[PDB]
Every structure is written in C-alpha cells, then in structure tokens.
C-alpha cells in the first residue's frame, strides 16, 4: 500500500529483477555510508524485502530472513531483520516506522521470534515499535563449535508477537559468512 | 501462470490466509497418507510456496525454505525443499515436474545450494531435473554440538545451479523434529 505518498511493496528475493537488486545494493551501501560488506549484502538476500518508493525511486528497504536458532536447548524459528535503510533526505518522516510495521506483521505470521543486530540509529526505531534489547548470552558457530558472541551482546534486539519469550535465555545462531549477528 | 490445464502460484508464507493454510495442511496430510507431523508442517512454513490448482482446487504444493549450513568448514546458503505433494488422482501428469522447475528457478536466484530429503516417490523426479544424491557425511546439532545424521545419509539430495563437492560434509541448522 501507499502511506503519505510512499509506496510499499513486499517482494521475495526470487521476485526481484537484476536491475532491482542493483538498485537495492546502491541504496544499502549509501545508507550505511560504505559500512556494508559483500557478506552483509549476501545476508539480506533470500527472504522477504519490504521496499519503499517515492514515485519510481527506491528510497527505503528492510529484509526478513529465516534463521534457525536455539533458545537455550529449544529450537526456535527466527525472522532475522537485515539491512534496514532509509535514504538520507527521507529520514525522520515515518518511513522506517512503516517498514517495521510491515516487518512485524511478516514475523508474526511466519516465525516464533524476531531478532536483529541494531545500529544506534536503528535501536531507537526498533524500541518505538516494541522490540527489546536481548538480555541473555549470544553464541555463534566457529569452526563447527559454539563460542560466545561477547562483543555483539547488548546490540541484538528481539520481538515476540504471539505471547512471551524469555529475553534472558541464551541464543545460539546458525552459521553464515561474515558477521554472525 | 498456467501449464497443461493446471494453474500455478508462488507466494510467501506471510501471504497465506488461514483458509489457504488449512487447505495446504489437508493436502499434505492426505498426500502423505498421514506420514506428516506437526513438526513437518512447521518445516514447510516460513519460505516460498509454489501451489498448483485445478481451477480453484489446490492439487499440488512445494516449499523452499532458507537454511544456513556449513559445507565442510565453509558457510553455504541453502534452499531446502519441503513438503512436495500432488493429490493422488492428479499424479503422473507432470505437476511435480512443473513444481520442481519453478523450485529450481527460485533456488538458483536466491541460494548457493539446493538440498532436500527424498522419498521413493520423488527421487527419480528430482534426478530428472538435475538433483543428485549427497555422497558426503551429514551432521546435525544435538544438545549444542554436532553429531552424525547417519540414518539420513543416502536419502538427502542436492542441486547446484556452479561447482559443489557432493562428498563434502554438511552441517545443518537446528530445528524441531527431523533435522533433514
Ligand atoms: C536491523 C538493521 O538494519 S540496524 C541498521 C539501521 N539502519 C541504519 O543505521 C542506516 C542509517 N539510518 C537509517 O537508514 C535511518 O536512520 C533508520 C532506518 C534507522 C530510521 O529510518 P527513519 O525513516 O528515519 O525512521 P522514522 O522516521 O520512521 O522514525 C520513527 C521513530 O524512530 C526514532 N528514531 C528514528 N531515527 C532516529 C534517530 N536517528 N535518532 C533518534 N531516534 C530516531 C524516533 O522515535 C522516530 O520517531 P520521531 O521521528 O517521531 O521522533
Ligand atoms: C522433498 C520432498 O518433498 S520428498 C516427498 C515427495 N512427496 C511424496 O512422497 C508425497 C507422495 N507422492 C507425491 O505427491 C507425488 O508422487 C510426487 C510429488 C512425488 C510426484 O508428483 P507427480 O505430479 O506425480 O510427478 P510427475 O507427474 O511430474 O512425474 C515426473 C517424473 O518423475 C518420475 N516419477 C514421478 N513419480 C514417480 C513414481 N511414483 N514412481 C516412479 N517414478 C516417478 C517419473 O519419471 C515421471 O515421469 P513420467 O510420469 O513421464 O514417467
Ligand atoms: N563494539 C563491537 C560491536 C560489534 O561489532 C557489533 O555488534 N556489530 C554489529 C554487527 C551487525 N551485523 C550490524 O548490523 C547492521 O549493520 C549491517 C551493516 N553494517 C547490516 O548488514 C545489518 O543488516 C544491520 O543489522 C550492526 O550495526 C553492528 O553494530 C555495531 O556497529 C554500529 C555502527 O557503528 C553501531 O551503531 C553499533 N552500536 C555497534 O554494535
Ligand atoms: N531408513 C532411515 C530413513 C530416515 O528416517 C530418513 O531419511 N527419513 C526421511 C525424513 C525426511 N524428513 C522425509 O522428508 C520428506 O517427507 C516428510 C514427510 N514425511 C516431509 O515433511 C519432507 O518435506 C519431505 O522431504 C523423507 O521422506 C524420509 O525418508 C524416508 O521415508 C520415506 C517415506 O517412507 C522413504 O521413501 C525414504 N526412502 C526414507 O529415507
């Protein structure tokens, strides 16, 4: 739909054209001012994109990836939020909020828990739509064994749609290239 | 689109209505003759679905879910194929093949490797569209460390759209029920 003149579309990676993927990369690399690696780009591909347009130009994005984690010893399906960006001139105008409202709806309909790793900019937005900083320990796979993600603790945030999740439990994430969180 | 009198639609789990979800569950229960658990149903939700219809009746389905695995020591992004079924009276008319052609296209656009655990009904079909038996060892997480998935070896199949060593070990991500 469209909200205050911005069109929002929800598209799986498999539904994007090459031109649309190139436009997405340009938006993301600019939005992070270069702090966006090739591995970061891989991490935002493979799930659902919510994309914001002013006329025909892409001006905002967020992706929701499926991840498979453990909450303590229990398997938990995760909607992992990646690569939220609003083009500079469009910021503080509600686009990030609209992207997150649609992201929350996607997570609620598919997964048991939303997770993400926040920037300082992002944290205020995710707080405003009901996410909380994860309070428990974080673990990632290195060479096939779990190690503590000590530096990422305090930066990961979560959201439970249906009911309650123990924010103090330990999370064990699945393996990928680059940054695990 | 359409193919040979059957309509095909691709959609993400997040777009399913409750009625569509219930119809999918009923199709899977009937098509697997009940060999399909609540965990199996969870495993087919969260990714892309390709659905086949005779006019308005759901007659076929396959899902592609994103998984995060290790190939030996290297991370590999996986399109994991779940819950392919065609209603019994519609079988052997090419619906499964059309579902797999669309599945291959989704995997090729999104992931580095396709993987699935086969049934005897599907194995020759998967072979016919490029899939091959995984020859390497399979591992899964139990109590936070990897153990060999010995019973599943020989039944997992893979598809490379590139080059992939089909003798490498695969380390899958953690879920409930059957890991493969
Ligand atoms: C999971 C991840 O992707 S983390 C990475 C987040 N992305 C980045 O850091 C890239 C650079 N930054 C951006 O692209 C943007 O600043 C975003 C995406 C973080 C926010 O997008 P915006 O469209 O500006 O957010 P929006 O206008 O909807 O803000 C909604 C509320 O969130 C809060 N908020 C948003 N941005 C900020 C900010 N920079 N500082 C303080 N509060 C903020 C405010 O409460 C705001 O409400 P208000 O404007 O009425 O005070
Ligand atoms: C990853 C997974 O989902 S594994 C589980 C697969 N699903 C099941 O076992 C549920 C029960 N079985 C079914 O629903 C169906 O038998 C399916 C989905 C496996 C196949 O669906 P169909 O629509 O019948 O497949 P389709 O008609 O496209 O067959 C294409 C080719 O695959 C082969 N094939 C398909 N089914 C069989 C079979 N039961 N026995 C031998 N060969 C078969 C044949 O070579 C066939 O070509 P042909 O008909 O010209 O001889
Ligand atoms: N002290 C070390 C912190 C550790 O490196 C870490 O958590 N690092 C965090 C790793 C995450 N993958 C990053 O995720 C965010 O940005 C990525 C691109 N840069 C996107 O791909 C990702 O989709 C998004 O979600 C996140 O931004 C990083 O946060 C860190 O970098 C931010 C930018 O400077 C800071 O604002 C944060 N306070 C700081 O913790
Ligand atoms: N000997 C041990 C076999 C081991 O249990 C195993 O690999 N078991 C395999 C476990 C997989 N999760 C199953 O996956 C298939 O069927 C599931 C529903 N039953 C779907 O959810 C799944 O989406 C699909 O992909 C797969 O079919 C099972 O295969 C086994 O059961 C099949 C049906 O009887 C046989 O035809 C196979 N030859 C046999 O290996």
Author numbering:
A (entry chain A): -2 to 178
B (entry chain B): -2 to 158, 160 to 178
Source paper text:
AAC(2′)-Ia is chromosomally restricted in Providencia stuartii, an opportunistic pathogen responsible for catheter-associated urinary tract infections with a high mortality rate. This enzyme is a part of a larger group of AAC(2′)-I isozymes, which includes five enzyme subtypes (AAC(2′)-Ia—AAC(2′)-Ie). Specifically, AAC(2′)-Ia utilizes cosubstrate, acetyl-CoA, to detoxify naturally occurring aminoglycosides such as kanamycin, tobramycin, sisomicin, and gentamicin, as well as semisynthetic aminoglycosides such as dibekacin, netilmicin, and plazomicin through the addition of an acetyl group at their 2′ positions.
Amikacin, a structural derivative of kanamycin, incorporates an (S)-HABA group at its N-1 position, but lacks an amine group at its N-2′ position, making it impervious to the effects of AAC(2′)-Ia (Ki = 87 ± 10 µM). The crystal structure of AAC(2′)-Ia in complex with acetyl-CoA and amikacin, a non-substrate aminoglycoside, is allowing us to capture the enzyme in a pre-catalysis state. In the pre-catalyzed state, the adenine rings of acetyl-CoA are sandwiched in between two flexible loops, with residue Arg89 on one side and Lys121 on the other; however, this portion does not form any inter- or intramolecular hydrogen bonds. Amikacin’s interactions are similar to those between the enzyme and its natural substrates. Although interactions are maintained, especially at the prime ring, the slight movement of residues around the active site in the amikacin-bound structure causes deviations in the positioning of the central and double-prime rings of the aminoglycoside. Additionally, the N-1 substitution does not form any hydrogen bond interactions with the enzyme, and instead, residues Glu148 and Glu149 shift to make it so the enzyme can accommodate the (S)-HABA group in a conformation away from the active site. The amikacin-bound structure shows that the enzyme is also capable of adapting the (S)-HABA moiety in a second conformation. This second conformation, as displayed by amikacin, exhibits that the N-1 tail can also sit parallel to the aminoglycoside plane. The adoption of this conformation is based on the movement of residue Glu149. Surprisingly, when comparing amikacin with plazomicin, different interactions are noted at the N-1 site. Both amikacin and plazomicin incorporate the (S)-HABA group at the N-1 position; however, while this moiety in amikacin does not form any specific interactions with the enzyme, the (S)-HABA tail of plazomicin forms hydrogen bonds with Glu149 and Asp176.
